[PDB]
Amino acid sequence: IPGRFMTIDKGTFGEYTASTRWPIIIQNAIDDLSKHQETEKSNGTKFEQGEVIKKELKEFRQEIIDRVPLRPFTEEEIKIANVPLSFNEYLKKHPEVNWGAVEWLFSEVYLYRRVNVLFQRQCEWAKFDIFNRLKQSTFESSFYGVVELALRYENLLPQLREMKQNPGNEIDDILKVLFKEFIEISLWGNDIKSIQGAKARAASESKIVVNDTEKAWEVLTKARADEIRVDFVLDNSGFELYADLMLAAFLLQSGLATKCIFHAKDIPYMVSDVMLKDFDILVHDLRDREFFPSGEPSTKESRALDLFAGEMEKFVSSGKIEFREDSFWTTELDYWNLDANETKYHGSILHKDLQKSNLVIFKGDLNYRKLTGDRKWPRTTKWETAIGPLATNGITSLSLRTCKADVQVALPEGLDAKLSQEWEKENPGRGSWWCCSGKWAVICFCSGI
Ligand SMILES: [Cl-]
Ligand SMILES: [Mn+2]
Structure with missing residues (x-):
């Protein structure tokens, strides 16, 4: 190894x-x-x-x-x-x-x-939290994007309830589009059926050099026709967290999930990584008209933000969204330690609990590095190989990673050379650093067996 x-x-x-x-x-x-x-x-x-x-x-x-x-x-x-x-x-x-x-x-x-x-x-x-000032100012400048999504959600919600209430293969096709949409929005952190919408997806999906989103769509659709639990091992707060809550909200309203559990950090971490209190701060931010200036409460922009904020509270009240923290996420241990034999630092506890999950979504680059041990794998290495015990110890996992570190795996032959040639223009002599630029992304799936 x-x-x-x-x-x-x-x-x-x-x-x-x-x-x-x-x-x-x-x-x-x-x-x-x-x-x-x-x-x-x-x-x-x-x-x-x-x-x-x-x-x-x-x-x-x-x-x-x-x-x-x-x-x-x-x-x-x-x-x-x-x-x-x-x-x-x-x-x-x-x-x-x-x-x-x-x-x-x-x-x-x-x-x-x-x-x-x-x-x-x-x-x-x-x-x-010495990074809270940074988290906030960054989320405040995403004002435009936050509202756009809030508006998109409010207008989708009546339709989503109807799609869950009367579900057939006809509606599944529509849901798939929205599934990929919310997945990719969650992925990139910081009309839909028209051209511009199609032009947008294709551009995003082109930079997703590995895409196993279909497989995650299968685990959930299947499970819906069997108590569907989805887990989020979170990354950054602000818009990325907002995007993650949007995915959860979509899953809950469509019927693709019934309970979403969010796993947060217990200390200020990686500057902008989510802590428990960052969720409450987010909701408060949505309602703060000095933070997000959308005018008087009657405006369409204001109403949308208040709606979603209220949807977050409702989901928590009903136990459909739950946030958690564990010291394990802030240790140095890689996620090969998410196995029964790690009994010192909660590794075995979380593993036992993550087995109950229908799908565990690992967000961000660090989580990806912990999954792959941050090791110098040949970049063609099979995904199941690089995650070690996670390939077999009974955890269904999906990794939504924006490439921002030297580690990279599961690439088809020749693709590392091509992308390196492309990025060679931006970073001469270091084409291999393409997977450190954040310009590309990968979506990797593993059943756990
Ligand atoms: Cl301050
Ligand atoms: Mn981070």
């Missing part, structure tokens, strides 16, 4: 990322922390505690630049911040790994844990 991508691997996107991107992220956190300091008094416990975090962040950023060895977490840090013990277990088995030379996957997870520790050490900042 190939090793994992490293921060030392010359000519890899991971090399650039570790050395360049991460120092910038820590800097942004310092600046955003400062930005937040402006809105509060310049003394007292909270301010001074901010000064301690700010300083330690500066030092931590410098650690990464200086390429120092990754230190274990102290027993005290573990207690105060409830750090999973998996980290120190990994470091023992990986002596003297430094930022300049360490497994990409680990050090990236490890980075956000170190940052979290800093905040949880200061009581007044334990619950503070």
Whole structure:
């Protein structure tokens, strides 16, 4: 089995990322922390505690630049911040790994844990999300797109109820189109039967170099003719989360699903990844006319946003949408650990629970990297091979991934060469980095048997 991508691997996107991107992220956190300091008094416990975090962040950023060895977490840090013990277990088995030379996957997870520790050490900042300012401003600028979808949903809803109420092969054909639509909207994160609509799908689907959406459509259609549970291992908040809720809402109203369970992160993570509280913030944002300026409540734009917001609450009340968090999602462990033999860090718990799912949707690049172990697979490698135990341990999984990392699998022969030639124009000498640009995407399915 190939090793994992490293921060030392010359000519890899991971090399650039570790050395360049991460120092910038820590800097942004310092600046955003400062930005937040402006809105509060310049003394007292909270301010001074901010000064301690700010300083330690500066030092931590410098650690990464200086390429120092990754230190274990102290027993005290573990207690105060409830750090999973998996980290120190990994470091023992990986002596003297430094930022300049360490497994990409680990050090990236490890980075956000170190940052979290800093905040949880200061009581007044334990619950503070240093990336919330960024999440919000990004979601606010998606105002146009949020409304468009809200309008699309309101006008589809009467029709969806009718399609579920009177279902036949005639209606299935229509639903398939909408299924691919909402899948792909969810995929790309941030009329339908006409030309422009058809021109749009074809353009999107062209950049989906592998597309197993039909198979997921089969598991659900089949299950509907047997209690249909769909799972979302989430990625980013804002519009991507909004898109995911739209997919869920579509599935629930059409009858393709009866309960959608969302799995979120339990700490500020990957800057913009979803936490439990990000769902409530989203709904509040929809209703906030200062955040999303759609005018007076009577406007069509306002009504649509309020409708969907109300649809979210209703689904939660009735138990059709449920959000969850688990420390496992924020550990370094890949999803080969979603197996019965991982009894230390909830891996076995989630696996047992994910077996009950008719379809588990893994969102985003990180989730894709954890599925494939972030390993240097030949890019033609079979999908079932790269996911390890997940191919057989009884989990039905669908991966909606925008390609943003060196890892890539399940490509047909020759396609890696073609796409590399295409991207060669944008990134000369590094055509292979096409799967790190986010321009292309893949949809991979596995029954679990
Ligand atoms: Cl703020
Ligand atoms: Mn993310």
